[PDB]
Amino acid sequence: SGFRKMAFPSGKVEGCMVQVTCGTTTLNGLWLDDVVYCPRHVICTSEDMLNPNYEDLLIRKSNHNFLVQAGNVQLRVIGHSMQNCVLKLKVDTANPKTPKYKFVRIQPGQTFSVLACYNGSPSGVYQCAMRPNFTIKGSFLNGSCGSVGFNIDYDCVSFCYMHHMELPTGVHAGTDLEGNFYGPFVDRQTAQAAGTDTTITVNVLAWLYAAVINGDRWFLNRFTTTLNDFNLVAMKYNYEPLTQDHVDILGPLSAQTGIAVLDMCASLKELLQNGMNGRTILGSALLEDEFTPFDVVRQCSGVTFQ
Amino acid sequence: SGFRKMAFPSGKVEGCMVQVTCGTTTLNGLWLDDVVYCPRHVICTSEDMLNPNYEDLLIRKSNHNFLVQAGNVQLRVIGHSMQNCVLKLKVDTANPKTPKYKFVRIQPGQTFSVLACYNGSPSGVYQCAMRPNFTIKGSFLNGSCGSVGFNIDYDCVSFCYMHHMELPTGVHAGTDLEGNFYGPFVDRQTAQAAGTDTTITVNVLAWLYAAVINGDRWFLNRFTTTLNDFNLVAMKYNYEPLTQDHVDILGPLSAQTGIAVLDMCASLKELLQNGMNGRTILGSALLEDEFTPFDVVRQCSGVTFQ
Ligand SMILES: COc1ccc(COC(=O)N[C@@H](CC(C)C)C(=O)N[C@H](C=O)C[C@@H]2CCNC2=O)cc1
Ligand SMILES: COc1ccc(COC(=O)N[C@@H](CC(C)C)C(=O)N[C@H](C=O)C[C@@H]2CCNC2=O)cc1
């Protein structure tokens, strides 16, 4: 029993983090086989960052302009290239700790574990979701760039996020590991802002299922609803539409608890319309939307990873 | 910017987790140097667990009754002993991955990271606090016993918790790594219950400081209060007393934000008396009490560990 915000164990990723320095700019890199991946703005200066031309900036660099440190060992850079917004540094040494891994570009609503690092060294781990507006609500300070987000599918580390910047609202933006930003953002110091966000409906429902699995039942009711009337209520409260694909995805939790998805939707409708009336669900006084259906199954059924 | 529930990176602990089997009972163990530590109820059966006599049960066992698996490798047990509620198994192989480490017994209110494991394999990591009633609000299923809680001080893993059982309210109880329970609990299947809990005041204040550091200021006011009148309010709302040691501990956050501890106490008094009036603090509609002052400093100042 119990239900907590739970990250994947981070050891496999810890073995890959390095420090990358160029000029007076230091940030983190991901060392996999004989390549180090990092944010390309490491090659910038204060003058460049306002409106940099990265192809120019990279033409003017040489392998010796890049200092890469794995622990104390210095790694020697034998080549460099740019792929979208990530720099790839070929080094003379393959990381002996390289896990089995994949690069994946995730959809809004999916969660992942973030290993926050500074100067190549891990500071901590936490869970995040990709918001519908393609920001994440992270915890990042100066020097955090290059920290990565990941899931651990079965045996395989799936990297899905590398950190690049903080927006004026205090939320965060970054790229997949092939250097493409999530959202409309760009890697220069300008006046970009997050669009208005919405609540991830399929995840709120998953978390209500987690609450039932853990003995919280006070929000249940006898009613059901149709997908259409529910989505009308959702639109009114700034919730994402619920699709039939979402209902199918929620299948297994529905089956384990015996509560049909549309019955749980009737509960959610009532919670949106009347509030909680001073009660809590899984220790929360607000509806939580950063657990996916898979996260709930994983934690309530005890899946392990090696 | 940002503030998240943040666990320590778990790699150093992942390298120490093994599986221990005795009879048909399997749980997890902690392999450090040439000793494996695990809950002694692994030597029990359904008949024993109601009121076991562990000295008897252990006299009747032999080294070959204990199967220890590190990954796939089987470790050979060359000795066994009991220390309080933990079993210590001497094995023929020193763990080459043994980190620098200490065993510490923590005080109520202190937090730690839990690496939940099943069959010797890590499932996930999360943050917990030792509640004033010496339970933790964890996430644990059958087979979780032996999972450990830890902090990473500087270079050193400080183990402070090993998991043994779940109480009827769905909360959790366990021991320090020398096998002494936190709280009045015992390792047999009987009718034990958690006492009534209280809220960890020094931690709520630390989290209000985190909110200020991150731009949440709407709860501040011009007033101050005395320790005595505050503690009167605290008692009325089931909050722990605030000591002068707590005020001193909160020193650094007071200094970084310029808000005196007793001014922040006046804010907390008003929040207790009037509620939040539909607003949130760091994304929460309730006052959070599982961040210590050190946790706030660690996350808002970017301390790293190697
Ligand atoms: C210090 O306060 C702040 C400092 C800067 C900002 C907004 O500006 C940027 O975040 N620019 C990019 C760099 C550009 C070229 C993409 C950056 O600087 N990323 C950092 C990579 O290390 C991560 C930032 C650093 C601070 N918190 C973050 O997430 C907001 C607060
Ligand atoms: C299955 O439901 C439940 C199964 C059992 C209970 C209460 O009983 C115990 O937790 N007894 C101790 C064993 C005794 C001898 C200390 C145990 O069984 N610990 C487990 C060590 O692996 C951890 C438990 C297992 C379930 N969740 C936990 O935290 C509650 C729910």
Instruction: Return d(Cα B37, Cα A124) in angstroms, integer.
Output: 26
Residue A173 covered by a domain:
yes
Nearest atom in ligand 2 to B52's CA: 15
Residues pairing with B58 in the sheet: none
Residue A185 covered by a domain:
yes
Instruction: Return d(Cα B154, Cα A121) in angstroms, integer.
Output: 12
Q: Is the CB of A140 under 6 A from ligand 1?
A: yes
Question: Can you say how many angstroms the Cα of residue A293 is from the centroid of all Cα atoms in its chain?
Answer: 16
CB-based burial label for B132 (10 Å; 0-12, 13-18, 19+): buried
- B145, B160, B163, B265: which one is catalytic? B145
Taking contacts as CB-CB distances below 8 angstroms, the residues of chain B near A116 are: 6
Give the residue before each break in chain B, using a C-to-N cut-off of over 2.5 angstroms; say none if it is continuous.
none
Q: Is B22 a catalytic residue?
A: no
Instruction: Return d(Cα A232, Cα B157) in angstroms, integer.
Output: 52
Residues B160 and B65 in one domain: no
Q: Is the CB of B49 under 6 A from ligand 2?
A: yes
Structural domain boundaries, residue A8: 1-14+100-197
Residues B1 and B127 in one domain: yes
Question: Can you say how many angstroms the Cα of residue A140 is from the centroid of all Cα atoms in its chain?
Answer: 13
Strands (E), chain B: 17-22, 25-32, 35-39, 67-70, 73-75, 77-83, 86-91, 101-103, 111-118, 121-129, 148-152, 157-166, 172-175
Please give the positions of A annotated as active site. 41, 145
Residue nearest atom 9 in ligand 1 by C-alpha distance: A165
Taking contacts as CB-CB distances below 8 angstroms, the residues of chain B near A124 are: 6-9, 298-299
Look at A3 and B139 and tell me if their CB atoms are within 8 Å. Answer: yes
CB nearest B124 (choices: A7, A122, A283): A7
Residues A130 and A182 in one domain: yes
What residues contact B258, with CB distance under 8 A and at least 6 apart?
none
The H or E element containing residue B190 is none
Residues A7 and A119 in one domain: yes
B112 secondary structure, DSSP code: E
Q: Is the CB of A144 under 6 A from ligand 1?
A: yes
Instruction: Return d(Cα B200, Cα B208) in angstroms, integer.
Output: 13
Instruction: Return d(Cα B163, Cα B172) in angstroms, integer.
Output: 8
Cα-only R_g, chain B: 22
What residues contact A23, with CB distance under 8 A and at least 6 apart?
A43, A45, A65
Domain closes at, from A197, A215, A232: A197
Strands (E), A130-239: 148-152, 157-166, 172-175
Amino acid (1-letter code) at residue A166: E
Residue B205 CA neighbour count, 13 Å, CB half = 32
- β-pair type (B101-103, B86-91): unpaired
Residue nearest atom 2 in ligand 1 by C-alpha distance: A142
Residues A2 and A111 in one domain: yes
Question: Can you say how many angstroms the Cα of residue B100 is from the centroid of all Cα atoms in its chain?
Answer: 19
3-state secondary structure at position B86: strand
Instruction: Return d(Cα B133, Cα B108) in angstroms, integer.
Output: 8
CB-based burial label for A51 (10 Å; 0-12, 13-18, 19+): exposed
Residues B209 and B189 in one domain: no
Structure tokens at B107: 């005080």
Amino acid (1-letter code) at residue B200: I
What's the number of domains chain A is made of? 3
Nearest to B182 by CA among B166, B161, B167: B161
C-beta neighbour count of A75 within 10 angstroms:
22
Question: Can you say how many angstroms the Cα of residue A4 is from the centroid of all Cα atoms in its chain?
Answer: 17
Helices A293-301 and A201-213: crossing angle, nearest 10°? 20
What residues contact B107, with CB distance under 8 A and at least 6 apart?
B130
Taking contacts as CB-CB distances below 8 angstroms, the residues of chain A near B14 are: 9, 11
Buried b (16+ CB within 10 A) or exposed e, A173-211: bbbbbbbebbbebebeeeeeebeebbbbbbbbbbbbbbb
Nearest to B86 by CA among B171, B176, B23: B176
Residues pairing with A101 in the sheet: A157
Structure tokens at A150: 């990941």
Nearest to A187 by CA among A217, A149, A145, A148: A145
What CATH number is associated with residue B10? Answer: 2.40.10.10
Instruction: Return d(Cα A140, Cα B218) in angstroms, integer.
Output: 23
Domain closes at, from A38, A72, A99: A99
Q: Is the CB of B144 under 6 A from ligand 2?
A: yes
Taking contacts as CB-CB distances below 8 angstroms, the residues of chain A near B71 are: 306
Structure tokens at B161: 């918790």
Residues A151 and A7 in one domain: yes
Residue A294 covered by a domain:
yes
Residues B106 and B192 in one domain: yes
Instruction: Return d(Cα A138, Cα A147) in angstroms, integer.
Output: 11
Residues B124 and B94 in one domain: no
Which of A20, A164, A166 to mutate for ligand 1's pocket (most ligand atoms within 8 Å of CB)? A166
Look at B304 and A119 and tell me if their CB atoms are within 8 Å. Answer: yes
What torsion do the CA atoms of A95, A96, A101, A105 make, to the nearest 10 degrees? -10
Residues A7 and A134 in one domain: yes
Task: Name the H helices within chain B.
Answer: 11-14, 54-59, 201-213, 227-237, 244-249, 251-257, 261-274, 293-301
Cα of B158 to nearest chain A Cα, Å: 16
3-state secondary structure at position B270: helix
Residues B192 and B151 in one domain: yes
Chain position carrying tokens 């020094």 = B202
Sign for the CA dihedral angle at A140, A145, A146, A151 comes to positive
CB-based burial label for A70 (10 Å; 0-12, 13-18, 19+): buried
Chain A, chain B: beta-carbon pairs less than 8 Å apart: 162
Phi/psi at A93 (5° precision): -130, 130
Taking contacts as CB-CB distances below 8 angstroms, the residues of chain A near B302 are: 118, 123, 141-144
Residues pairing with B22 in the sheet: B25
Nearest to B23 by CA among B85, B83, B66: B66
Residue A306 covered by a domain:
no
Residue B254 covered by a domain:
yes
Nearest to A206 by CA among A238, A235, A247: A247
Domain closes at, from A67, A99, A131: A99
CB-based burial label for B241 (10 Å; 0-12, 13-18, 19+): middle
Cα of A187 vs centre of ligand 1, distance in Å, is 10
Instruction: Return d(Cα B182, Cα B175) in angstroms, integer.
Output: 6
Q: Nearest 5°: CA angle at B117, between B170 and B58?
A: 85
Amino acid (1-letter code) at residue B283: G
C-beta neighbour count of A279 within 10 angstroms:
10
Residue B35 covered by a domain:
yes
Residue B33 covered by a domain:
yes
B200, B240 contact by CB (below 8 A): yes
What residues contact B98, with CB distance under 8 A and at least 6 apart?
B15, B16, B31, B32, B33
CB nearest B285 (choices: A1, A2, A286): A286
Q: Is the CB of B165 under 6 A from ligand 2?
A: yes
What CATH number is associated with residue A240? Answer: 1.10.1840.10
Structure-determination approach:
X-ray
Structure tokens at B21: 């089997």
Which of B20, B140, B144, B166 to mutate for ligand 2's pocket (most ligand atoms within 8 Å of CB)? B166
B263, B255 contact by CB (below 8 A): no
Instruction: Return d(Cα B277, Cα A194) in angstroms, integer.
Output: 27
What torsion do the CA atoms of B177, B178, B179, B181 make, to the nearest 10 degrees? -80
Which of A41, A161, A164 to mutate for ligand 1's pocket (most ligand atoms within 8 Å of CB)? A164
Structure tokens at B293: 């002052």
3-state secondary structure at position B227: helix
A50, A94 contact by CB (below 8 A): no
Residues B88 and B117 in one domain: no
Residue B306 covered by a domain:
no
